[PDB]
Design a protein around this ligand. Structure first.
Ligand SMILES: O=C(c1ccc(OCCN2CCCCC2)cc1)c1c(-c2ccc(O)cc2)sc2cc(O)ccc12
Ligand SMILES: O=C(c1ccc(OCCN2CCCCC2)cc1)c1c(-c2ccc(O)cc2)sc2cc(O)ccc12
Lengths: 154, 154
């Protein structure tokens, strides 16, 4: 059992590293790192509900959209965390690039991210990214509300 | 080396468990889980800058404010992740409780959280919590902006 777990963790880490380093046109093939029913998405949005992209066909379509709306995106400062579950990794990183959203001015978007990767049979079954949406609001020119801090100790 | 790493990870895990289960008046003593120069705080805020509380004395003072502002806070759905670093843990969980911020109506706040715990010599050197601030805005009656999604594939 231990040999199987160690083997799974070392392979899975290679997939996480490949995912994090996928840039440019190679993003069009990143759905091949997922299971056929694999899910990937953004868990932190304005609405409070995740934007989850389900299955390889939809994952490949999102990649096409992502090459237009995040054309030069890169992950930086990547720190990969293995866990006690050989099939579950976390990654802390930053991301940055142009943001080209329909109906908004072209901007520059930078944020801090956490990613969760869960594996099944050597491929990603579930990828989730978590960030602070206020920074994406700022990149799009959307006003961010401010919590009033006068009564809070500082 | 392996003996020392295994011992560190087992002890540190117990501290993470104790931290996550601390509620009520026991919150007043939770700063004793930190190093004298330990830091804890919220890394995801409206301003984009962390709210970091530095040093055991200030951590103890924030606990007094925390018991006023979040009088019945509970962490739920706790999943603790050990990592390859025996001194670094991540936690995925939910949190809920009344929110009683100065000058806002009393609310009920629920959110999903990620926590990072870094240890030094048996105590927490750095705790950081990450969430979606839009859910805290909702709990305070603050309007959340909406990204227009008409041009995005759905
Ligand atoms: O910026 C995004 C977004 C960014 C990345 C996403 O997923 C990243 C993970 N990735 C998805 C498939 C490929 C591999 C994993 C999802 C939404 C937002 C949106 C989006 C983008 C494209 C699309 O077709 C539908 C909705 S909508 C939105 C609202 C917000 O408040 C914040 C971000 C957003
Ligand atoms: O909700 C918080 C907040 C909550 C928890 C925080 O820290 C958590 C860690 N802390 C130290 C270690 C032990 C546990 C408490 C910090 C800010 C926000 C604020 C706060 C609360 C109390 C205070 O005295 C000063 C500022 S201000 C603010 C603005 C936002 O956009 C979001 C949250 C907030």
């Amino acid at each position: 059992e231990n040999r199987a777990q160690v083997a799974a963790r070392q392979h899975n880490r290679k997939i996480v590293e490949q995912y994090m380093h996928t840039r440019g046109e190679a993003r069009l093939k990143r759905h091949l790192l997922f299971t056929e029913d694999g899910v990937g998405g953004l868990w932190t949005t304005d609405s409070g509900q995740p934007i989850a992209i389900r299955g390889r066909e939809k994952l490949g379509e999102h990649a096409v959209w992502s090459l237009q709306c995040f054309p030069d995106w890169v992950w930086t400062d990547i720190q990969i965390f293995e866990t006690q579950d050989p099939n579950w990794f976390w990654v802390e990183c930053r991301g940055e690039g142009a943001i080209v959203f329909p109906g908004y001015p072209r901007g520059q978007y930078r944020n801090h991210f956490l990613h969760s990767f869960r594996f099944e049979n050597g491929l990603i079954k579930e990828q989730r990214e978590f960030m602070n949406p206020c920074e994406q609001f700022r990149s799009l020119g959307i006003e961010v509300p401010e919590v009033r801090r006068d009564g809070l100790p500082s």
